[PDB]
Design a binder for this molecule. Structure first.
Ligand SMILES: OC[C@]1(F)CN=C(Nc2cc(F)c(Oc3ccnc4[nH]cc(C(F)(F)F)c34)c(F)c2)OC1
Length: 276
């Protein structure tokens, strides 16, 4: 459901957060709640069809889980769409680790369980995130973890595309289990400050993956991590999606099911951020 009103009534905008990849996102206080919200402002061109986004907004609203950024309500007004969202004060894990350096085996483990909690719920709703990485895992001042979900014309013009071709332009080859893979890369990203093959051209990384011989990547330093963290990487990055375990199966992995995993590990992290 979309509300048709100036949202500058309801909310005072307190600080501009957004930059390159996030675009325009504002920290804002709710005039009624007195509560803190993130307002993501979307720019809309005349020939941008509104009715097509209303289909992508349902998905955001009926996504109700602690481990997913809560949707509050969209606002169309003056050729702009403002999406109101749970605020996460520490921004993304990427913002964090670029200052704090590498995350610890136990820090990464709690992040891997909270994410799986969110993916396991998404999947149960037959939804697929498509973009698990550091930049899309957000952190609140409590040190709790929240998956940011978001929601091309030069893939071709569709008018001539045959239907099977059009089926892929919307769906990609994406599968619920492709989100699991991305977590494995993300875990390495948290460990190493960059995903495998960051120093390699993207096209080449795409070719290399589609070679028959392609080898799932690994943690650089053997001794630095437990057998558990090693096995978590091995299993999440299984090549064949037919054999890659689901998010519930992964929640019963020893790396994420161990005790002592909780938000303190991150509060540590958020302290490390204040006091270098
Ligand atoms: O281009 C990258 C930079 F220049 C360097 N760092 C950032 N950090 C950054 C900036 C933002 F605006 C972010 O968005 C939020 C911030 C707080 N609470 C949020 N709740 C939901 C969101 C989101 F809109 F879904 F993302 C959100 C964010 F998560 C991180 O972006 C600038």
């Amino acid at each position: 459901d979309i509300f048709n009103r100036d949202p500058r009534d309801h909310y005072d905008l307190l600080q501009r957060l957004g930059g390159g990849t996030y675009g325009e996102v504002f920290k804002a206080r709710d005039k009624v709640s007195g509560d803190l919200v993130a307002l993501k402002m979307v720019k809309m061109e005349p020939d941008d069809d509104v009715s097509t986004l209303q289909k992508e907004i349902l998905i955001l609203k009926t996504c109700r889980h602690a481990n997913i950024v809560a949707y509050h309500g969209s606002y169309l007004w003056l050729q702009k769409l403002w999406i109101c969202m749970e605020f996460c004060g520490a921004g993304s894990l990427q913002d964090i680790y670029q200052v704090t350096g590498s995350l610890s085996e136990l820090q990464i483990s709690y992040v891997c369980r909270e994410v799986l909690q969110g993916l396991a719920y998404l999947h149960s709703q037959k939804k697929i995130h498509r973009d698990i990485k550091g930049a899309n895992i957000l952190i609140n001042d409590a040190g709790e973890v929240r998956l940011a979900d978001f929601g091309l014309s030069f893939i071709g013009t569709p008018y001539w595309m045959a239907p099977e071709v059009a089926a892929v332009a919307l769906k990609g080859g994406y599968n619920e289990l492709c989100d699991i893979w991305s977590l494995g890369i993300t875990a390495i990203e948290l460990a190493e400050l960059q995903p495998p093959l960051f120093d390699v051209h993207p096209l080449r990384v795409l070719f290399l993956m589609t070679k028959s011989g392609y080898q799932p990547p690994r943690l650089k330093e053997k001794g630095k991590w437990s057998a558990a963290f090693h096995n978590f990487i091995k299993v999440t990055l299984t090549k064949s999606p037919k054999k890659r375990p689901s998010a519930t199966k992964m929640l019963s992995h020893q790396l994420v099911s161990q005790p002592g995993l909780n938000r303190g590990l991150i509060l540590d992290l958020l302290d490390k951020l204040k006091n270098p």
